[PDB]
Antibody, heavy 224, light 213 residues
Framework: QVQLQESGPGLVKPSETLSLTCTVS??????????WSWIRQPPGKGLEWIGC???????NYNPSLKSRVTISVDTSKDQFSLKLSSVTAADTAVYYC????????????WGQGTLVTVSSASTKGPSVFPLAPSSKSTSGGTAALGCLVKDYFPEPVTVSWNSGALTSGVHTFPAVLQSSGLYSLSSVVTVPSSSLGTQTYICNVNHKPSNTKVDKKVEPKSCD | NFMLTQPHSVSESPGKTVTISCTGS????????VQWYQQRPGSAPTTVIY?????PSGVPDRFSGSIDSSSNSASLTISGLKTEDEADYYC?????????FGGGTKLTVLGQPKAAPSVTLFPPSSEELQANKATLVCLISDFYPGAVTVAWKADSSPVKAGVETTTPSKQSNNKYAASSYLSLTPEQWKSHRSYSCQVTHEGSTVEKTVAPT
């Protein structure tokens, strides 16, 4: 059959130019007389139509998105790309490259949606801090310990305990936007309090866009 | 200025029949073809009907669509609701060289019971203090329903500046999980005698406290 795969960076700065290219495998752009269209979808919102293109220069754009959508087709590389101008923070949507058989009809084949996030900061590494359990951190026969990930850009960040050997009781929370640009989250694991002083717990926080891997040991709090 | 109106929330128990509407404002609903798309969360949308009455090869027969052109409303009838039917439904149009989608109708199947909100409090670390930063982290876990209100306290005064909290998220054991973060300066951490995080869940309050030690 045929398939549609998108490329381009998943991040874009405000008031910049977006470059997302969708490539085609198993078919031909010019042959068959079909259309191409770009459709975006914000998280938790409905689908929004951006524009449609033919293998020739025919183009039609949404009236709300007019004078900002620039889409071109290069038949030599068997792909088409969309360029967006004046991207704001409200442009955060999942971009879908869907094949369209009938111009007034269905989008029969949909490509997988790339995530586009618009934020205003410089890509910075995370700051990992230990989360020391204590007497106030245990309720009953079990205790809790974790690791804090604060002031990083962008999503996502993965946290693994003991190089993935500890999975039971591990809770990784979704990130939340801080008061100034960056994100923050934590990953914690519930453990019986008997093995607090006899077992070593190390969290492994990885931030691929900033290329930072931080291993932080977790120990019980020492009163000073 | 043609927009498709869809019911935002639709719920029905499995095995029954539910009708999803799609009303056009200006243009008539029989003017252009209407396409319904069923999209799973975290997945690409898939076409489940086309030509307003024809089912594509692969979808079940139950995805039946009807057109009420007098009321300018497009209808999609679902019979025999199942677990996998829980997805976002969007209706499509074309207008005049400008494809217009629908508002979005979510299929609800129409669940663990109340769960105790275990609470853990963590003081700022010494390594963070050496970095001229401080953070109080409150953890909220193993609870149901997923609606917890947090309120930080500085000994007795409530704290709102620098408070960051997370929306509840479902756990592996059918319960929910949440967190709250209190950004603070190293001087403000030692200025007050103690800091506490109070969790209100279904009226009951679970409180933990921490002190600089």
């Amino acid at each position: 059959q045929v398939q549609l795969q998108e490329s381009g960076p998943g991040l874009v700065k405000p008031s910049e130019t977006l470059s997302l290219t969708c490539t085609v495998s198993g078919g031909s752009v010019s042959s068959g007389g079909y259309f191409w269209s770009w459709i975006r979808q914000p998280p938790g919102k409905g689908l929004e139509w951006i524009g449609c293109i033919y293998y020739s220069g025919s183009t039609n754009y949404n009236p709300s998105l007019k004078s900002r959508v620039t889409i071109s087709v290069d038949t030599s590389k068997d792909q088409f790309s969309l360029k967006l101008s004046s991207v704001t923070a409200a442009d955060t949507a999942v971009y879908y490259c869907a094949r369209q058989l009938w111009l007034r009809g269905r989008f029969d084949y949909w490509g997988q949606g790339t995530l586009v996030t618009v934020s205003s900061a410089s890509t910075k590494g995370p700051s990992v801090f230990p989360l020391a359990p204590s007497s106030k951190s245990t309720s009953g026969g079990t205790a809790a310990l974790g690791c804090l990930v604060k002031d990083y850009f962008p999503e996502p960040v993965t946290v693994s305990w003991n190089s993935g050997a500890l999975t039971s009781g591990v809770h990784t929370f979704p990130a939340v936007l801080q008061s100034s640009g960056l994100y923050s989250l934590s990953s914690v694991v519930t453990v019986p309090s008997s093995s607090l002083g006899t077992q070593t717990y190390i969290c492994n926080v990885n931030h691929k866009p900033s290329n930072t891997k931080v291993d932080k040991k977790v120990e019980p709090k020492s009163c000073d | 200025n043609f927009m498709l109106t869809q019911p935002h929330s639709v719920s029905e128990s499995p095995g029954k029949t539910v009708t999803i509407s799609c009303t056009g404002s200006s243009g008539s609903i029989a003017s252009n073809y209407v396409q319904w798309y069923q999209q799973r969360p975290g997945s690409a949308p898939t076409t489940v009907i086309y030509e307003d009455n024809q089912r594509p090869s692969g979808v079940p027969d139950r995805f039946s669509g009807s057109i009420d052109s007098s009321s300018n409303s497009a209808s999609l009838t679902i019979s025999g609701l199942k677990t996998e039917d829980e997805a976002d439904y969007y209706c499509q149009s074309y207008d005049s060289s400008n494809v217009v989608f629908g508002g979005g109708t979510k299929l609800t199947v129409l669940g663990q019971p109340k769960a105790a909100p275990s609470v853990t409090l963590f003081p700022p670390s010494s390594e963070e203090l050496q970095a001229n930063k401080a953070t109080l982290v409150c953890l909220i876990s193993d609870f149901y329903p997923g609606a917890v209100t947090v309120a930080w306290k500085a000994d007795s005064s409530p704290v709102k500046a620098g408070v960051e909290t997370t929306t509840p998220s479902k756990q592996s054991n059918n319960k929910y999980a949440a967190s709250s973060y209190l950004s603070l300066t190293p001087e403000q951490w030692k200025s007050h005698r103690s800091y506490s995080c109070q969790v209100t869940h279904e009226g009951s309050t679970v409180e933990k406290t921490v002190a600089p030690t």
